[model samples]
Target: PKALIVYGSTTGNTEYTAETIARELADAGYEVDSRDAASVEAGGLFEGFDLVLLGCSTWGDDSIELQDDFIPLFDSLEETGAQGRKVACFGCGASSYEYFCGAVDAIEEKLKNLGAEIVQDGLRIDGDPRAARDDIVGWAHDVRGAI
Candidate 1:
């Protein structure tokens, strides 16, 4: 199976999480592509990928930066019959925020509007994503099974 791992990071924390997720996906025997969410063609990059994994770091405790591209990207995908494509999301953020990992929530909603079928629920890693490595792998395994 093919998986695309994309992320929007300002302090590199989100990028690290994306890489770890990609490695975990690779170890799970899936072909994976990890890239910046903003740099990639958010609308069509799903191409041959059966699963699209979105990761982002919380900015301003509200939304993610690069992932904002999805607003237009999903708009395009809607008319392209790209709905119900499998997707899962994750992100890191300050625990102090009232709504932690809000970026993931935003992405999840966009994915839903684009007709993407979600595997597992969004995984929120507060502040340090390194601590969630084990959970991340386990979550990927669960998502794989769901797929």
Candidate 2:
């Protein structure tokens, strides 16, 4: 199945994770496309694919508002019919934050609300996602198994 990795990065941490995930998905034999969260027709874009990976960064203790554009775009994914689709979500969060990785939780919930099957464990990384790339790859592999 083809997979798309879309991300909202304010400080580049989330973009780093999104690229790592796209490369790993490509290596795993999935046709993967990675893009900034603001570029797509969100509510209508998931119909042709079987997998999606969403990444974001946390803000305000438990928010994913860095890419304000993302909230409006993503609200539309559900408009496309998400039945049986597979989804995986991830993000970069600071350990100092009270709700580390809370942004991923928001995205994950959105995926669930869209009726997409979650194929991988959502990855929450430190602010420097470079250090967590290996774990992201490993989680992607696990998600492949689920799909």
Candidate 3:
């Protein structure tokens, strides 16, 4: 199987999270393309992938926020050929925040509205995702199984 992981991270937690997922997918016999959202364009992003995983850390004072670089991808998601695409979302969230992992929720909502098939409910990390390594690994394994 083929997979793509695109992520935006300010403090690098989400980047590490994405890298782990990518490694898990590759170890599971998948062709995985992992990238930082800063270098990705929304158009045709999902066109040739069997599965797409999006990651971004939540950043907001009292409102919901997507990571800085991912905002471009999120804004132009409608052009990503996401319709009917198999998708999953994951992200790190500050439990101290009002909306924990709200970026994941926001991304999943947009993908669903754009007609993408969400393979699973998003993986939400309580804080720094590295501390939640087991959750990340388990979620990736199950996500791979879903495809």
Q: Considering every candidate listed, which one attains the maximal lDDT?
A: 3
- lDDT (Cα) of model 1: 0.75
- Tell me the whole-model lDDT of each prediction, alpha carbons only: 0.75, 0.78, 0.93
Displacement of the residue 23 alpha carbon in candidate 2, Å:
1.0
lDDT per residue (tens digit) for residues 69-133 in model 1: 33444345454334768888887787787667877887788778777888899878876778878
Can you write out model 2's per-residue Cα lDDT over 1-147, one digit (the tens) per residue?
798788888888888888877887788788988888878776667767878788878788444453564666566767755657778888888888887878788777877886788877789897688887789788877877888
Evaluate model 3: give its TM-score: 0.98
Off by over 4 Å in 2: 62-66
lDDT of 3 by residue, 55-137 (tens): 98998988898999999999999999999999999998888888999999999999999999999999998876878999999
Which ten residues in a row are the worst by lDDT in model 3? 123-132
Candidate 3: where is the Cα deviation over 4 Å? none
Models 1 onward score TM values of 0.85, 0.89, 0.98
**Index of the highest-TM-score prediction:** 3
**Model 2 misses residue 25 by how many Å?**
1.3
